[PDB]
Inverse folding.
């Protein structure tokens, strides 16, 4: 099985940028598609984006199409998330997922994802700076 | 006698139970391997392409299946019409000969109505032609026998070299089918079973399609006349 | 006479040219609409998903088609069970050969070749036995009296073996009024296109379909045989007059 | 119409920032991409991106270094190739085939709309 460790959450100004990371320490030599999800305080879990195991193709949800960029360091097995021009609607717990059975894109919540991350709290402040 | 009708019925019923047991033993282990393969191939496709949602895959898989049911092959950019002057003539012959392959079938409302009436009047028309060819074949068989069960083996073996072996060679070189697949097509065709898993002029000559129906016509009227000549002796015996 | 063989051959040939012209006129406009739709749907999929190569699409379409040909539906998450395999064997013997399911294995195709070779004449002897018993029941101005009774037996048979089962298929399978009759006609004529197959709800549904095929097939073949026997006798009187 | 902007000399290990604005009034939707014609080799695909920008593709030659971006409001694609190699010295064209033929081959011989092409040289 795979094990996911995150790094990048925290307080950020409105309009700023969010830089997250997620390293897959699991020795699962089969290949797995990775992704990023966010659980809003009042809403359900939403997909942010996805990226294949090799990193040759990525996907971005309609809520963050032109702002986010899912990167991947295949040598160190790590995914990255760079969300530019932040809004108070982005305030959520950001989890990284990795289902190597094709169930990552199953739904918008990822209720069928095999490996889940620890989750990192991201809070977007505005005026209160 | 009615006693022999119940006896023949019981023999037919146990033959289907026996055959069914053999068919399951050969096909069901492979059927389970095919079910696991498509499920795996879909789960790999969705994992390698994170852009395609599992429902977006199912939607396209349904479109491909829908086109195949209609007759148009989803594979390829030419999506070679099945209803051209010659291919539609061959389809009509497929109905008349009670073969009914099923690779192509009348999907329209009017086509199904016309096919119902076409078979009703067309099948007895072909039966009269088969009777005519069987009468001329019977006179040749009667003269070849003169020059009773030993002679029946001679006519059946020779027929399997000209109408069964010879055309299977042509199908193996033209269609590129296996040695077994070429014989299996010939047998299923001449027995008017018409599974449709293999059909002449599948997917890529002008004389090829009319030479297949002529082989069906001569090959069908030869083996039916041999079975009727035996059936004539069975009625007397 | 050989003159009548060439005449019957020409009549059969023009009937296929005539039928083929009608079939093309009904099916080809729809065939073109189906060909344009799949081509468009594939060109949209490749445009919407820049990650999937046109060959990578062809490879998956082929896998879906391969699984469909084998009997397993690619859509979703057995055809060879005790009863379904028995019905398949009967489908071979009756020369119907639907084709929805077919022997995909190497050994299954070999067994099917031999199974049809010996099985089709076995069924013919059973059809002969049922036709003899049906002929005695059927038996229980001179030329028109014998033909008047032939119309009575043919019309009644189309109410019991054709009309009555089509009602059952329309309510059980949910098929259209035309689709229910079209299935009955294509099944009873041993054509077996496979576009519609009984049992696609009840365990007694599969054995009741083969029994309908058995009685329905042996009734219409016996009527064609008892009519063909009278037609052979009438052809002898017609040959002596003209 | 595909107008490009970003070509030029860049030192080894540096970064290349290309752009391609689609001035064509084709209100059907089209998948865009980036290609490069090497001096001695044939035309190769660099990457691709859908009309909306919801999904991108990167060739195996540059998957870990490049990033195909898109400004949907101004209908423009961007290419940010970092840690450049000498092997990246080529003419970079931007393509836009809205009929599914962008990914057809590795050269893009079936692409509908082609860009002007920008010369890129890596020292
Ligand atoms: K038949
Ligand atoms: K048939
Ligand atoms: K058939």
């Amino acid at each position: 099985q795979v094990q996911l460790v995150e790094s990048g959450g925290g307080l950020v100004q409105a309009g700023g940028s969010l830089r997250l990371s997620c390293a897959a320490s699991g020795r699962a030599g089969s290949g797995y598609a990775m992704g990023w999800f966010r659980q809003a305080p009042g809403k359900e879990r939403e997909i942010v984006g996805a990226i294949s195991w090799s990193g040759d193709n990525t996907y971005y949800a309609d809520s963050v199409r032109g702002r986010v960029t899912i990167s991947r360091d295949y040598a160190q097995n790590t995914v990255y998330l760079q969300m530019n021009s932040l809004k108070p609607e982005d305030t959520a717990v950001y989890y990284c997922a990795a289902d190597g059975r094709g169930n990552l894109r199953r739904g918008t919540a990822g209720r069928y994802v095999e490996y889940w991350g620890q989750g990192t709290q991201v809070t977007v402040s505005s005026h209160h700076h | 006698k009615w006693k022999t009708v119940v006896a023949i019925f019981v023999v037919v019923v146990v033959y289907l139970v026996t055959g069914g047991l053999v068919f399951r033993a050969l096909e069901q282990p492979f059927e389970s391997s095919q079910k696991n393969t498509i499920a795996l191939e879909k789960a790999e496709f969705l994992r390698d392409h994170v852009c395609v949602s599992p429902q977006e895959l199912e939607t396209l898989i349904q479109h491909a299946l829908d086109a195949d049911n209609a007759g148009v092959s989803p594979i390829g950019n030419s999506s070679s019409s099945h209803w051209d002057l010659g291919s539609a003539f061959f389809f009509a012959g497929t109905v008349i000969t009670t073969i009914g392959y099923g690779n192509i079938a009348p999907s329209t409302e009017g086509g199904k109505i016309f096919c119902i009436l076409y078979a009703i009047f067309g099948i007895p028309l072909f039966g009269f032609l088969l009777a005519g060819i069987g009468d001329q074949l019977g006179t040749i068989f009667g003269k070849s026998i003169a020059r009773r069960v030993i002679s029946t083996i001679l006519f059946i073996l020779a027929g399997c070299i000209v109408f069964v072996t010879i055309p299977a060679v042509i199908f193996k070189y033209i269609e590129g089918w296996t040695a077994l697949e070429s014989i299996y097509f010939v047998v299923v065709t001449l027995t008017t079973v018409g599974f449709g898993d293999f059909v002449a002029g599948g997917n890529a000559r002008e004389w090829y399609k009319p030479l297949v129906w002529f082989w069906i016509l001569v090959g069908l009227a030869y083996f039916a006349a041999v079975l009727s000549m035996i059936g004539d002796w069975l009625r007397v015996l």
User: Anything to note?
Assistant: The first helix of chain C runs from residue 2 to 48. The interface with chain A takes residues 50-51 of chain C (CB under 8 Å). Chain C is about 80% helix and 0% strand. Helices of chain C lie at 2-48, 54-70, 82-93, 106-139, 142-172, 177-188, 205-241.
